[PDB]
Amino acid sequence: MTEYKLVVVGAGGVGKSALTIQLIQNHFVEDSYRKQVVIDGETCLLDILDSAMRDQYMRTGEGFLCVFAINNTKSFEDIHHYREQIKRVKDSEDVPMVLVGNKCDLPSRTVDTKQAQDLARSYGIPFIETSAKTRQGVDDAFYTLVREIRKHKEK
Ligand SMILES: Nc1nc2c(ncn2[C@@H]2O[C@H](COP(=O)(O)OP(=O)(O)O)[C@@H](O)[C@H]2O)c(=O)[nH]1
């Protein structure tokens, strides 16, 4: 079956681990994960990972979940750095990515959905708000990234 190498990036504390645990273990709170799921009918295995070893993992990774938290303006501002690093290490301008705004269950929002939608539009990538606590958007975020990887492999 097809294997998809995913890498989750973003500032500390945004919920990268919480998100992946919710996806894989189905509960709210390991540096890597491996599970078989069915996405759009295709059975596939998700291999997920949250200096030279970092670069190797980025070269191996086929899609990147770029995570900020809606209550962490710095983490949103840092997205550009993470995106630029991935493009540099992979030496490519077309890298499958999804922008994730996590912790959308919390009331302390400092990043407006519109800001994140505009950023994702500039990058040409999908944007999805998630909550690792309530599971809102979690499957959609990872499955959307897999769909982005497919389009890149087909087109
Ligand atoms: N309310 C809420 N807390 C979250 C969410 N995601 C993560 N957290 C909490 O944020 C803290 C940091 O999460 P963690 O997954 O360790 O962040 P990481 O450093 O990005 O891997 C923990 O206390 C989590 O329980 C979320 O969607 N909602």
Ligand SMILES: [Mg+2]
């Ligand atoms: Mg973590």
